[PDB]
Design a protein around this ligand. Structure first.
Ligand SMILES: NC(=O)c1ccc[n+]([C@@H]2O[C@H](COP(=O)([O-])OP(=O)(O)OC[C@H]3O[C@@H](n4cnc5c(N)ncnc54)[C@H](O)[C@@H]3O)[C@@H](O)[C@H]2O)c1
Ligand SMILES: NC(=O)c1ccc[n+]([C@@H]2O[C@H](COP(=O)([O-])OP(=O)(O)OC[C@H]3O[C@@H](n4cnc5c(N)ncnc54)[C@H](O)[C@@H]3O)[C@@H](O)[C@H]2O)c1
Ligand SMILES: Cc1nc2ccccc2n1S(=O)(=O)c1ccc(F)cc1
Ligand SMILES: Cc1nc2ccccc2n1S(=O)(=O)c1ccc(F)cc1
Ligand SMILES: [K+]
Ligand SMILES: [K+]
Ligand SMILES: [K+]
Ligand SMILES: [K+]
Lengths: 446, 447
């Protein structure tokens, strides 16, 4: 079959030793760099057709971070790939003790649809840098990006080492029967379990980048002008279709009306009085998801927005108030421009609220008080944390990006991507000379 | 069930926050130091009854490294647990960026039988230091150690946080239905797949410490006296029942006879003429494994040993020559005192041989030529590597221990244990003051 052959050719090319020299990897990454520069309009086009992105946010909210990752990895590769000496003991002074980094082999990257370039290519960059063959499975939901990547990747990159495989569920099930040396999966908690089950059959290590509801706690005595502007930015970009979007707000009932009004002011600033007319406002990926997000608005108190167009898959920036935690909008990942506000009367109640639910990919807190920040961090568990801003904690090379519990396992970005797509091999090199100090270990015992 | 209640009590005790302060963790580790000191003779008795270990090798080939691990972690815990500052970027000048370490929750440790104290308690030490509740599932095959640990662990460690669950396959199957936040499993490649399949149902991360056949390449132009003494020591300790034992030898046919003779000399030095009489020589764990290893000797050219005793599960140190790589002794992990010699005509042939097989837990090479050492490392893959020795690489705090591919995933020992049993949480703390530099990111976008 097409899938079986593509994978075969990928392993055969890895087995030939082609990817081992650092210069080969760098040249593949520089080819990727040229692909992004030369196919920029095509990439914008794909994102515009899939998610209603424009040339600005297609670049500065997705593409640029791939480029920054490529530049960073090219520069750092010599340092990362070097044998790393580790601390010796008095008994191992004459020995070499070091960590040897080596490729895993054939890596499978399964992408998702909300950032269909970044979440296919940024994992790929790390895997290429680590010296792996990389099989790409882009999301079928983002049809235009999926089609484009299958076309343009083989034009710039090694055709055998880095194949693109497109398809739906059966094709993915078929792909998952193939033997890989690592699988990075970005997607749902439910399918994540299926991915790990398939990986178990070949003892394939997994990086699962999954979902959940990222809580956003707003402290009663903080600058709400700054806070709500930052929150509205993170929540409503890509029409709320961000894994690290502030899913819901936790706040004192005394500031709920103030929060509504400031989110309001920020949303008008960003997208005008009518967001349907903003070139900067996105659309829902599919009809299936449009219906889902609209269904979560039913039976709720709509403080802002609430209306949607099925033909264009537009959903107005919606703010819900006094939301019952047991209602549908607070029982699933929204992944849409619907921001529910849930009232809690203390920091302690907020911590308990977060702790009683599944561990989120991101946790957000807005507070002028640092003890509040540190207390919430120490008493909760989440993939990552950002205090007094949203989203940005995943844009920094020095901060590994990943989940915990239901939000996932493993992590990547920057050096972590190199590590994750490598095997770190402990090495002890000794002289083959008679050492009297070793005599104690040999039988007979004293 | 008793299994469900024990896991429930462990989660409840963790959810209380009891393990969070470092003093509490240190106190549990000190209790393990106390356990080892006060139960030394009982630990020896268990290992003697299970594996025919003696008071010396029970301590110096197992127990002492748990103690060293405990001493090391107690000292380093403040350093490890502290928030880790990371490198800033030009825009993140006024921000705090760090990595915050936190426990995962309830960790399950499934131990194996060959080093039944070390491979239950060393992983536990790491999981304790990282602030987890820890459920211990000792191997049923090492019966005496399993029983002892069920008795002595609650006598020293917190009873709710650190329960011991004994049982066979049915009990483990039920235990694997419980929800854990991490599982460290030490055992076979096949059962590793079963554990990972179970873990998938709860999205539980796994550290799998598995098996394979660790190759030992012996170069032509090296000191064979020194080499074979080191090899024989690694291969024949614990009656060959070591995951990182040099499973088989790859060498040029021109040095095969010399290797045989020098292995024989070393074995005579170690255990005498008749190893059955040596206090330092172990026994096979079970009747099933006795028959299995004896089966692997059949049809082979025996150059030394080759005999056994079913009643005592004794198998004489055995060397096999001119071994067909396709024969039974070369198609499975031996895990016994049978050392096959397989002939290769070059380093290149040896590299190809290793690469055709599944990735081993350890890879060994003996050579005076650094280029041979570096080429074999660069062109092969294995969990860990030692050049000009065996076993030792697993005893060092600064070298993480674990497999790759069929030999496993993840790693532990030293700092790596703390990291493996923690969630490393990326944290960005910004000031809540107006920043003009951030305004560029907000809509509306420029034309
Ligand atoms: N952590 C991250 O980095 C990150 C990034 C983006 C999105 N996400 C998460 O992804 C989720 C949304 O993305 P999504 O792609 O799951 O959307 P979705 O669930 O709408 O997409 C359905 C996808 O699942 C696949 N699928 C369905 N059944 C399958 C089976 N039996 N086997 C294999 N594949 C199967 C389909 O092929 C399809 O691609 C959100 O929960 C979000 O939090 C996480
Ligand atoms: N990497 C390491 O740290 C390390 C250390 C020691 C041993 N090992 C490996 O362990 C292997 C031998 O140890 P072993 O414990 O597998 O002994 P073994 O092969 O005798 O296996 C018996 C064990 O498997 C379990 N088992 C069997 N079927 C099962 C099922 N369906 N579900 C759950 N459990 C099941 C049994 O309960 C029993 O405990 C060797 O391959 C060795 O390399 C690895
Ligand atoms: C760098 C990065 N890591 C991500 C992880 C998940 C989703 C998008 C991600 N991105 S991203 O697409 O580049 C990105 C998305 C939004 C944003 F505001 C800034 C960056
Ligand atoms: C420290 C250590 N790491 C291990 C990993 C696997 C099996 C035994 C292990 N040990 S051990 O039992 O202490 C050990 C075993 C044999 C030996 F020679 C020295 C130490
Ligand atoms: K309501
Ligand atoms: K001695
Ligand atoms: K630290
Ligand atoms: K602006």
């Amino acid at each position: 079959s097409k899938i079986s052959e593509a994978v075969k050719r990928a392993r055969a090319a890895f087995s030939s030793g082609r990817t081992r020299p650092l210069q080969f990897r760098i040249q593949q990454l520089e080819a990727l760099q040229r692909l992004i520069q030369e196919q920029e309009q095509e990439l914008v086009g794909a994102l515009a057709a899939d998610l209603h992105k424009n040339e600005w946010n297609a670049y500065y909210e997705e593409v640029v971070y791939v480029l920054e990752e490529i530049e960073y990895m090219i520069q750092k590769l010599p340092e990362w790939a070097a044998d790393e000496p580790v601390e010796k003991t008095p008994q191992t002074q004459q020995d070499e003790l070091y960590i040897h980094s080596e490729p895993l082999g054939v890596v499978l990257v399964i992408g998702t649809w909300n950032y269909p370039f970044n979440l296919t290519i940024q994992p790929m960059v790390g895997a290429i840098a680590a010296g792996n063959a990389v099989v790409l499975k882009p999301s079928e939901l983002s049809e235009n990006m999926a089609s484009l990547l299958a076309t343009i990747i083989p034009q710039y990159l090694d055709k055998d080492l880095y194949p693109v495989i497109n398809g739906g569920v059966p094709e993915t099930t078929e792909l998952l029967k193939e033997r890989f040396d690592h699988i990075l999966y970005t997607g749902s908690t439910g399918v994540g379990k299926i991915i790990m089950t398939a990986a178990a059959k070949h003892l394939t290590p997994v990086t699962l980048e999954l979902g959940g509801k990222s809580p956003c706690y707003v402290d009663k005595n903080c600058d709400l002008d700054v806070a709500c502007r930052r929150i509205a930015w993170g929540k409503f970009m890509n029409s709320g279709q961000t894994c690290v979007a502030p899913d819901y707000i936790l706040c004192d009932p005394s500031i709920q009306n103030q929060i509504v009004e400031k989110l309001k002011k920020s949303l008008k600033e960003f997208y005008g009085e009518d967001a349907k007319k903003s070139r900067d406002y996105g659309r829902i990926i599919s009809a299936r998801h449009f219906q889902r997000v609209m269904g979560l608005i039913e039976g709720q108190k709509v403080a802002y927005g609430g209306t949607g167009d099925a033909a264009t898959r537009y959903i107005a920036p919606t703010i819900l108030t006094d939301v019952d935690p047991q209602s549908p909008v607070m029982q699933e990942e929204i992944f849409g421009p619907v921001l529910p506000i849930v009232c809690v009367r203390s920091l302690e109640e907020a911590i308990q609220f977060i702790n009683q639910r599944e561990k989120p990919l991101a946790l957000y807190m807005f507070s002028s008080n640092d003890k509040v920040i540190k207390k919430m961090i120490a008493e909760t568990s989440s993939g990552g944390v950002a205090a007094n801003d949203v989203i940005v904690h995943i844009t920094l090379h020095s901060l590994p990006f990943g989940g915990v519990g239901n939000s996932g396992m493993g992590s990547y970005h920057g050096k972590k991507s190199f590590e994750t797509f490598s095997h770190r091999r402990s090495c002890l090199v000794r002289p083959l000379m008679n050492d009297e100090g070793l005599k104690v270990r040999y039988p007979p015992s004293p």
